[PDB]
């Protein structure tokens, strides 16, 4: 039973990752073939860059605005920038815009989507000028909808580029997002790559490589079938036709945390296709605190638990080649359930052989994944992704359980946020202590016991030397991405 379980875990997890790697390679080959047909200085899709933020660092907001202004795409309509402000503390952030683009900030008294005439002409009168909208604070969906209306005002706009407030775009990060929209008539949305730049703290570095894996191996595989489930928040283009069609149903959803997931699922439900372009890069920061990361992950997992049913229900709309979407959703559910069941069974049946074999198998699977990541990114630091196998067991599984319990129920705030996490940590510690107490003997004459002790000690040495390598990298500042070094230098200069 245990041997079969740990054998399945290693062919059911590494096998699908190999399949995703192959599909991602095929998708990248297809995109390279498309790009090789792109003529020089190509620009045929008028875009309207949309930036929506609530309370961002003035430095990071200025960097994002300057990065948008640095884009080399030769066909941009405007820079509709919606801010959930209209307050004294938030006005300062809008001032950043006034020192980067212009003093064309507008202060409408009402939010467009909560108005009787939800049309762009109520706020803006001139469509040929960059505009900053200081609408009342209601959320990100409301500001994105106001941006959608202001973009749809222009009859010459064919696409809309959505960017987070603190996303430092690359130079060709607009040309490579909106190009695939013209490659196929069926493609109505494109998701660009988002790379973490603040890779200094351990959690931030592990999350950076999780982002890289999820965008290059998990989103590319879906992009091969043109069924990307979630367009990246920091960067993504939408055709103006599909956004005009789905801006009404996406809003008034009956609600606050999905944001881009519901938009992408709407594009899927309409029957259209979404691709992913790894050649378009947008840098964004990652959470550093473990508690804040757990809160963010439980919000994301609540949104995922809400949207997986709508994603599954739209798999028939795509007919054939839509089996991959339903299979991916089913695999996502069964992976978490199988991990929980296998680890609970292993903890309950305190066998040192099974526990050590499970640890070694998981470490080897993560090592193979990180090896492919290092090959793909041409970066050795990708092997730090091995340590990410800790985060999934301490910051993700409790997040999944908390999201499931909150969805099932549909100092109290602390208990609602951190009580399954603390209970999970106490349970893991208790399982370890019970395994140590029960299996408290030393028999250096059994091959099986020799294997168990040698394996656990070698794994401990492996993670210790990986952590030592990370520590010497941090003190050497080798871990910092070049963008992080540039941003730190410029912030110190200020």
């Amino acid at each position, epitope marked *: 039973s245990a041997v079969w379980g740990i054998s399945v875990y290693g062919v059911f997890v590494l096998g699908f990752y190999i399949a995703q790697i192959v599909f991602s390679e095929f998708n990248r080959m297809r995109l390279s073939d498309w790009i090789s047909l792109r003529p020089d200085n190509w620009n045929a899709t008028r875009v309207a860059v949309i930036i929506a933020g609530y309370r961002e660092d003035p430095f990071m907001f200025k960097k994002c605005l300057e990065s948008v202004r640095d884009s080399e795409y030769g066909n941009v309509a405007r820079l509709i920038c919606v801010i959930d402000g209209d307050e004294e503390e938030d006005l300062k952030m809008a001032e950043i815009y006034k020192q980067v683009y212009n003093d064309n900030v507008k202060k409408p008294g009402v939010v467009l989507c909560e108005s009787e005439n939800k049309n762009g002409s109520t706020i803006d009168s001139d469509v040929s000028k960059n505009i900053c909208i200081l609408q009342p604070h209601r959320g990100k969906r409301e500001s994105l909808y106001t941006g959608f209306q202001l973009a749809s005002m222009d009859p010459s706009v064919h696409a809309v580029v959505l960017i987070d407030s603190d996303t430092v775009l690359e130079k060709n990060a607009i040309l490579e997002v909106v190009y695939p929209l013209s490659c196929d008539p069926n493609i109505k949305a494109v998701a660009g790559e988002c790379k973490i730049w603040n890779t200094d703290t351990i959690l931030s570095m592990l999350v950076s490589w999780r982002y890289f894996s999820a965008f290059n191996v998990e989103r590319g595989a879906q992009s091969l079938w043109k069924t990307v489930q979630c367009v990246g928040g920091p960067l993504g283009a939408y055709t103006i036709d599909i956004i005009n069609e789905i801006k009404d149903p996406w809003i008034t959803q009956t609600c606050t945390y999905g944001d881009d997931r519901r938009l992408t699922n709407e594009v899927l439900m309409r029957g259209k296709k979404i691709v992913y372009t790894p050649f378009a890069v947008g840098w964004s920061d990652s959470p550093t605190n473990v508690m804040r990361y757990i809160v963010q992950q439980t919000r994301w997992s609540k949104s995922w638990c809400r949207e997986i049913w709508y994603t599954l229900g739209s798999a028939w709309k795509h007919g054939f080649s839509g089996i991959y979407l339903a299979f991916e959703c089913m695999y996502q559910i069964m992976y978490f359930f199988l991990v929980m069941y296998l680890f609970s069974y292993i903890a309950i049946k305190a*066998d*040192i*052989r099974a526990q050590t074999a499970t640890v070694l198998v998981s470490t080897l699977v993560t090592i193979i994944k990180s090896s492919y990541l290092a090959l793909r990114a041409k970066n050795l630091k990708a092997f730090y992704f091995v340590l990410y196998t800790y985060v999934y067991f301490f910051c993700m599984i409790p997040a999944r359980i908390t999201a499931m319990f909150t969805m099932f129920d549909i100092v109290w705030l602390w208990a609602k946020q951190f009580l399954i996490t603390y209970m999970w940590w106490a349970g893991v510690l208790a399982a370890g202590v019970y395994s140590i107490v*029960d*299996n*408290w*003997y*030393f*028999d*250096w*004459a*059994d*091959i*099986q*016991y020799r294997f168990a002790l040698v394996g656990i000690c070698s794994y401990l040495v492996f993670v210790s030397i990986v952590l030592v390598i990370y520590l010497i990298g941090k003190i050497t500042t080798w871990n910092y991405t070049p963008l992080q070094k540039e941003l730190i230098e410029e912030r110190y200069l200020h």
Partner: nanobody
Amino acid sequence: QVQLVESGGGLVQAGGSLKVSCAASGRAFKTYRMAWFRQAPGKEREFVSGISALETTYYADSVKGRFTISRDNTKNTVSLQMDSLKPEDTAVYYCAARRYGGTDYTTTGSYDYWGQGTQVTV
């Protein structure tokens, strides 16, 4: 500490089938290495069989394919079956137990818990 009580030892003059087993009373029998030791008039004490903590079987080179061992954690007993007994095996069978040890499981000084034993009369 563990206390061992040995049972078995009927006359099997030419072949047969009987069970000799040592019931153990202690705290944690799942983590004890059990072993079987003979004592013959011409010798002092010898290893004949032993089952490790994780159900690993060990037999002596002289008698390997004519033996078996079993451990019952639900009863804290271990039994050594008899297969094609020979006249040279007229020794008194003892039961040995240990928790912490090294790479020597065939010596009498490795184990620190012993029972009383029983004859064979074959």
